[model samples]
Target chain A: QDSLSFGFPTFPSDQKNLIFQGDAQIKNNAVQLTKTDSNGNPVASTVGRILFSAQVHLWEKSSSRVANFQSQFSFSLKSPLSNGADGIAFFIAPPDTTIPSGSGGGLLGLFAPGTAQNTSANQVIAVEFDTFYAQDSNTWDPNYPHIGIDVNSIRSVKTVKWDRRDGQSLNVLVTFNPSTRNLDVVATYSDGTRYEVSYEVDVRSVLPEWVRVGFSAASGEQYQTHTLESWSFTSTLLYT
Target chain B: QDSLSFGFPTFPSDQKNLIFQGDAQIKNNAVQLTKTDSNGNPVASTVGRILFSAQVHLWEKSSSRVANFQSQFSFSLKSPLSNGADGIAFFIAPPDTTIPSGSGGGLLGLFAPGTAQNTSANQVIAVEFDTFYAQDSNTWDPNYPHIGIDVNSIRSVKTVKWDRRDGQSLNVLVTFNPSTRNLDVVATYSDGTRYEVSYEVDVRSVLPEWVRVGFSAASGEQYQTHTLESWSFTSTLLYT
Candidate 1:
């Protein structure tokens, strides 16, 4: 059993054991993923562009693609206004370790110029807690702030339009149960129902055996403090 | 290309990524695997157990066991006086990323207690830079601080009588050529000799298709600042 369990705010002094990029830092017991300072003053605007990503753990080597793991973390969003601009996501990327570089605002720190930019493959498995709306006609409309259990792109297999703000904390629990080859998620909502959404993902086909697991969050001109409250994770390498 | 290339001193701020346990930390711009602190300030009798192991990078995951890889590193032994004590070893372990703990002195860091306190399988492959000389007979006698290429136990299949601190840095370069199934090393003496220490490792037969790649070091009562001065590594998961 190779597992990592973390309590927020007071991270281990071995912060050097983790990689943080672009405005990402461990401050005030939470992972602050974007720049919230202007002359050291915190402001909420509906128009600036910012992207921040942090990768926490590296999976050791193995041949087995099958794995059983569970992750639980709670997030909170706050600003001077209602909900802030843009949103956040959780990602499992290839072993490059470096943060995938994408533009700020709409990319949510997961995109790299193109799936449309070229045939370059976006090697990743992303479960985005996207709170932004895409008004473009071609992309599936995310008309409201919602939970997007995504694969490689921001394009979701399942997107549930639910209110993301209600002054209550946002929570997420995702699990991959290999015995049944099932992966499921139960996430945040203003509503009281904690509905489990099951997904059929042949993970190995889309990913290598080892990867970088972490979170990425961004904001448009409008801003909200995106925080990682507490997190727990566990996994087994033997697929059989 | 799942190669992990690292230059000593400044390490990626990801301890969880590397998996360092016991008496290890990033110091003096290099990876210090053992104790270099205090003299009588720190007790030194061969009575207590002390171990420090650090696994820096993952080999990534692969379906194929055949790999083309090479690793190069230089380690030194220094203390308040003389070339201190204990030893260092580079390792490739099974899925269990934790250190294989052993008692102080001769054993280095590979032990399961069951390999002794009862019946336990010493499941691992290693190349040790052993520097301790055990006085009593029965065990393999490494009279001088020498180079040891080992498997399963600290006992080496191939070991050479080389003085570790002869003003020459303990340099090692091990390579595996997947196509020919050849594994070899050129190390120890700095007289500029790159003699190949050839090996026939039916890797998949004795080991899993893939194994965790890293290093571990420990100290007995005689302690040294077991250090990695500069390091380099390369690997490709696929045989082709």
Candidate 2:
């Protein structure tokens, strides 16, 4: 089967626009964004201490389960304090016509129930790049939320911290290893240092990994509104 | 302080009668009787398939913190199950005293609030001889209603299963290991077969090991009238 790429130039610029859409409001901060190949399928360019937040909605629903997906979000600083919202997540839910409110920080409270997010019965899995303690201590333990993978429940299977200081880019790579049924999350700081957190679980353990991959964000009541810069997703379904 | 051995004596004539005093009642063809030790302390005897159940009225009483002088009970079984009550349990709480009912299954419904057993602010630890399911698959898993020692709120640090076939006799030795701060429950069957269970905690982890211990039983509306064969207990305060 032909694999599809969303953010690259091989796809017509017009078709790419329909595939990967970004919130137009916060594009010109300290970050320069492009969906280029040399830096990987979907890459980001940013400078100084940039806080880029955005949400995208994926539409091409697939019947096959998601075996794996990757995200590369970076911070351009080379100090111990240099931090980027380490990585991103892949969420699958029933398609609701109304765009839901992205309430809390990072994954935009996508997992929080009572929103427009809908999925068929027993079908929902979200991989999240958590950045802040948006909810209670029982839900999110650390003061700062990091990158994590959520199955049907909001509970995270894996997470790691990210911090950078000088003006260099901190990169994160997440891969789902099918053999061990584990999600391997690796992060690289601007100084060329990398770390990995592996979560051993079968893809069958979670449903709907192959849903429309998109971004959702919200800021109301307690937090300030944030914008999604740019986002994209691609996949290959393997048959036995 | 001198350590005294109460019930066991070389002379049959010197045997003292020990009586069990409390809300404890016999069930399922079991009878409650008392025998005296040489030192005159009362020891209760269970004749058949019996569960000596009691309701403890102490509030927030635990092995770690002891409230001012509240009443409790403890006992050592004279004969360990050459077969084992499928188990027994010790409960502390307000006296919502009611006869225990049900299949004598999981947690034995001992601490079940739905049974109106009155477990508000109740603290329970049970040592079960579970010939039944050890896991909670049904309402009557053999893991309940027996007595146990608890630390904080965690249940199974150390536990024992005490079910023996009818007419089988066994002896159990209870010792407090001061160094590891754990309770060692050892049983010697009549034929000299031995088995043991230990908890990895200090007596101070809950109330002092010397706290009063007693028996109570309840037959729910469905299953009524159980029995208590016999019981004995001895304590030594370990001080270095």
Candidate 3:
């Protein structure tokens, strides 16, 4: 129980039940969503859109353990969303299974097709702030609506070109510098102007020093599915 | 009285008095001094010292209201002052008048010598930020250290520079653009980095929209004095 503030307290009128199934799922939360895909489809809807989330447990086997974690959340929209379905993503996986990304055009399915078939090898690491470019015309890979830093699976290490609109409100600050193990990711722009992105990794050679921190989305077929109204995480653990 | 907040107030330490003298003269705050000339020779200090001052009513009878009674003060220094005696200056003259300019070196004592004057056009403008250097040796103008700017009695502007130090912590924004009657001096630094040294001017050509800002210093014969602490101002008014 390091830090797992969730989201989607409401707003879910229908868009295929907005996955993560009913009651909005909030159990021993380390995140566990399978929603289907290996040719099963069904993992769509972001209902009226406007979602945001958080989850943490970066590691705590105890030694009076105290890793780090800082979080933030935001949402707003009275009426706005023309073609709708914009952006928002930040993930790091390996808990309760279910990894299959890449869906229709909007992609956020995480990368479907058997989901990295048992991922492994430097486990996972994600940092997406994508603002939909239709996943570069359905994976033609032209860097579409940028701001990426995936690892394992979707690969990509650094990508830029921020802010394009989908409900505005975006502020991210991810820190994990166990004395230079590096992972700073400041992103502020409410007129203050800031975008210092860094990612050095080496959580003792990938995964295991701590793990889970999630968030995912999918609208694929066409615009109109976008929501994740809030999320947060703040961390600072070196050993133990 | 609409919005003002003050803290840390405490003055009165065995009053020896003589802070501003005369009309309490010290309009517009700008200093950089080290003097001794008139053959007593010895002067140095200059970088881009700026000072435009006023407080004259001269019992106002109208010479266009005493030339619209000018006023402008500007200074920048948050660190840097090498070679000794680099401080002390304060001006607001008019009484027994002394406005010569253009003598010995560039006129750090600010005009008032033989005559042929022409120190730029002298009415009044100052520069001090000195760090010893002397050419004709009127007190050492060797590398770069004297400068003056006066208007009414004329001695309009002079220059010198040997790398004149001090410039950092400047990003002041003051605009009075009623669609551009002018008065914009935006200085910067604090990451947003900007300082080509700005000044727009033309508020009817120079002062006359309510003015009174202050500063003064003295270490004559080079006692080396320097300290002003804090100052702030922000104004916007245009109603056509």
Candidate 4:
């Protein structure tokens, strides 16, 4: 009878999360997707891509309560300007899935270079904080420094330079209001400035009733440490 | 069967850890204890005190491994020379507990005042990174700036001035080898200098076979921010 609203960081015990692939491990208390030295392992690929997910699922069917969700996470991408590569994605994919194939670098490890992620067989909706070259244009779009969102494709439906003053306490809040069918994303800065973007999409149209929620981060030729310092999310499940 | 060896900052799902008590929350992936403004909340003896714990015992009986552990946590206590009140302590206490009573200021919130937390009913083994006054003695002992180890008492069993230049990447490693009955502490500066201290204490004499592990921090009077950037720990379990 509880709504699906909760928040936390990685677990410290041997209770392995569905660390499906990559060198993903819950380090410290955060889900550290990639350490700078993670690239040192496995020669087949030098890039770092990690997927650390939860064991539960969002409502597969409507719950008696509400079907809206508002998830806000605290994350920071720290690196010297010269070595920051790639970025991270807040994603919702079907449960029990593996790492996206042949995906790294600006791909943000969400999908392979070609197929669309949202409408593909895997079905994913991602909001990316990209730092490298844009996967579509293959360049670090000035307007594409670190803020962007993508629904089905790697292409940004909306993006602007990241709010650097977000400082150490950088925050991102994504709220989904089913009544208005509006998915709103806000970037909050430590300096007290907020940048926002909203999209109108019926999530039920794209995702199955039950879906896995978590984060995926990567680093490529230009090495950097991609870490999920701390993130929390909650949603109302109307199981019908 | 599983051994309880972990706890966390909140995760966004319904997995609630009995990581009970205090204003502890998962922030930026770290188990954050007290903020500069924490004193503003909850009336009366409103001094900062937080206890973030795990659900498992450290050396639960009947595990096929050794009952030894090494806990390494990355922490930073940012304080002004004037307002750096109490400090933080990495302590091991009984599982499912709250901040010790009358435990503000130099108590570091690990144990109640006027009693030894280590040798008493509420057992605790702590390594403190103190920044404020030395509660009882009430003086800035030359040893007051950085490191000390305490068992049952706020009075340290051992003390040392920590190596400072760790830059922003302040890291601490505490290794306990029960077989040798030896406990060692090392503070690493960002410049790579390692400062150390070791103690000889038999756990059979100081604590029970099963105990909870985690951190507790506080800021009283002159307020400062005690941030636990990241922390990780692992131990061997011995099942007889």
Candidate 5:
């Protein structure tokens, strides 16, 4: 039996059972995924990420059944400059995935810019809350703030535009149902703005039986503070 | 597929998704289940408990199959008197179960003193780490520090004596395998002392299809601090 669930009303000072990499740090009762110095000071042009320490069993090979999982998180993106750079993402990746070197800016710290942006070898499923977009970047990004479903590529297969209101912490909920293989994502803002998106995802095709779930973010020349305030996840599987 | 797993490195300040009843309180990054004054000070004659705030699907009535679960927690007990007052327990009970009134001392804050101690109506199963014992009491207990398995009664069916060393924190792991219907418990101390105990529990017989998992503790006239330092749990159920 393998069922996984956890809730963090606020991040504790001790980072037990959590792996913080690069510039990731616990600050102000939240996970600061990017824009932080080693001494816990704010900095620019950095990448930060955090992952649950253990690998979660995602699907069963014999039964061909995928685990049903639900995840919710509260996050805030603050821009020091006129525009926020990059964004943050909640992702499920193959076991042993680490922060890609030389990753920041538009890459969101997930992939190396010049080393094959999207390839089959990179197996990652992510729901990105992108605040900044550029038309010239190799990663096909929308001009406005958006949310996307990314599979092994920075170029999302499906994307939706939304109002990324300034100075407000946002909430997102993602749920996966095995019967329909639908990964549904809903984002809500305090201003009563809600956006819903769905992707027909088959975990068997994109990921292995065991995977890591985590958050990653980055800051470019124009940096933004990415903070994960609260998070909770639940995954369930039934086997005979 | 329904798999449930969660880990708490430390109890968060906010009781989100957690139900605290009676004297239960979060103090010093741990769950203080008992021996706490209303103003967060130490006191005697108190009963406190906390639950996960949700019903776990324990078994499938249609398929006659039960869930497999694993739980782990770290704890500490400090006594004001020469002997620790009562004890602490990790329990599985019917959904909507609340802290019973007049529960303290030998009852471990689980059942009423004059009420029927062990009855089918109780529908509770627990693994208790008992530090106090009195042969003359209604609930039979070992004189030394020990662990036991209790079903619908404070009196444990299976008991094992342990060193219960002074000043060292302790850890416990509980696992239930559906194939064996074995609810196995292992307790370890900083001094390398380890104790293992098991019970072949049929959830279908002792509990219903859904249940609440939680921790409970009590202090008598001579009080002891019962603190759950950290906790985690996972349960899996499979159906076709």
Candidate 6:
């Protein structure tokens, strides 16, 4: 059997092989993850999530080899305010994962409000392109616009600044090397600036052998429009 | 016929399918490009180059399709000085190319001192990871540590700040998409920060159907050690 490989250069009207949750939608041939008004401004206090309809083979049980993955996508985040609220994430979770309760804003729709941060039951890993910096000690977010790697918690174990000026669409490449267990994110802004970050997480120890992968975004008091222009994913198993 | 695919996880003592130029050598299983004193400090005023032993098929004449390429490598730059002089590059040049005179220091061993730059005869493309800034307007170097795309000239056509602090081996991925004619660079530092940059260049117009591919580095005045730890390259021609 062939390993997983798929791409959406432009989202079809039928929305095949995909699922949208909360404020997410297919608008103008793109995946818009935050609600927008007639004027195209984002609505406040909203959360969005989108995932591939089928479960991905994250690891081969028989061979004991994890699948290596590469995901490339184009996305844009536009806010009316100077700094956009919260942010967006490319995430992988258990097959039964859902948008947890009270997961709006800085939670990024990946974790519950509390009691679940870093818990075994809440297994997930994400690369968050975050704009807002929350002051709370619980989150411990970086002060500047940053890209973070979050595993089972909103507080990123590793983070790097996103130094793009004003607003521009971004081209992002995320790769997971099973041997090294390093998940890397490379983002290139439309203006030509590029930022990258990586964190090591052994998927076989965290999520199950099968997983769901997708995008999650949120907005707080200040709102922004999050749009995904294109996405492509390829996964392969390298036997020992 | 199959497209090109090769990798060097660790350089063999025999040094198969590779050529070392100037001070370049396979030392301790890594490509060391620059002479080092007994104390392990970089010697001043030197140039080093390493290339694939065979020419690469960059474009197919009958199919009229340009070859897309992806090159990934791990390298380290170490200097005793606060800011190292000169730097290193991943380059593609005509098969008959030779090390130009006075190509040391900021020239990156890719171009001659003057007169030859921007000339049709000097057809070369390179992504330079630069450490020093030249005060001359002719070179137009950036003050900060930067990554630059050079087309037949030492002055970069496009540049982006590397933003890495101190010394750290870097993981770099350079990709050329024939369809878009975009040559992109994504670099990941050991500390987890990532930076990316891209420039559009029609290689079919600037290079021959077949070309030599590899690395070039130099040192002048203040100096530093440059080493390539690993490398892998793959290329494919997409037919119409």
DockQ of each: 0.03, 0.00, 0.00, 0.02, 0.09, 0.01
Residue B94 C-alpha lDDT in model 2: 24
Model 2 Cα lDDT, one tens digit per residue, A146-211: 656665554565566644233444455555554456666676764577766777765554442223
Docking class of 4: incorrect
Candidate 3 per-residue C-alpha lDDT over B76-125 given as tens digits, one digit per residue, 9 for 90 to 100: 33222244443323343432333233322234344545542543344333
Q: What is the TM-score of chain A in candidate 2?
A: 0.55
**Model 4: residues >4 Å from true position, as ranges?**
A9-20, A38-66, A81-83, A116-122, A134-143, A164-167, B1-240
lDDT of candidate 4 over A1-240, digit per residue (tens): 123333344334343323445766655555557654444221212334333333233444433233577767777666655536677778877666556677876677777766743445447778887766644545424444657767667767677767442226568898878777788899886777777888887777677655667777777666456666665566555433
Highest-scoring model, TM-score: 5
Model 1 over residues B1-240: C-alpha lDDT tens digits? 122233333343333345566666665456666654544222232212111122222222233435576777787766554645567777676645565555555566665544622212665667777666766621564567666666666667777765656325667888877667666877865667543466666555556544566667776666665666656555544543
Report the C-alpha lDDT of model 5 over A1-240, residue by residue, as the tens digit: 246676666775644457788888888778999866555444678888888755676887765657899999999877656777778999998768888877787888888766534567578899998877878663478778889898888888899997766568889999999888899999999877899999998888899787878999987776778889998887876442
Q: Pick the candidate with the highest DockQ.
A: 5
lDDT (Cα, 0-100) at A51 in candidate 4? 36
How well does candidate 4 match the true structure in TM-score terms? 0.46
lDDT assessment of candidate 4: 0.60
Q: Is candidate 1 or candidate 5 better by DockQ?
A: 5
- Chain A TM-score from candidate 5: 0.93
The order of the candidates by TM-score, greatest first, is 5, 6, 1, 4, 2, 3
Displacement of the residue B219 alpha carbon in candidate 3, Å = 9.3
Angstrom error at residue B108, model 2: 80
Model 5 achieves a DockQ score of: 0.09
- Order by lDDT, highest first: 6, 5, 4, 1, 3, 2
Residue A178 displacement in candidate 4 (angstroms): 1.4
Off by over 4 Å in 3: A1-130, A136-240, B1-203, B207-240
TM-score winner between candidates 3 and 6: 6
Off by over 4 Å in 6: A1-240, B136-138, B164-166
True-vs-predicted CA distance for residue B133, candidate 6, Å? 0.2
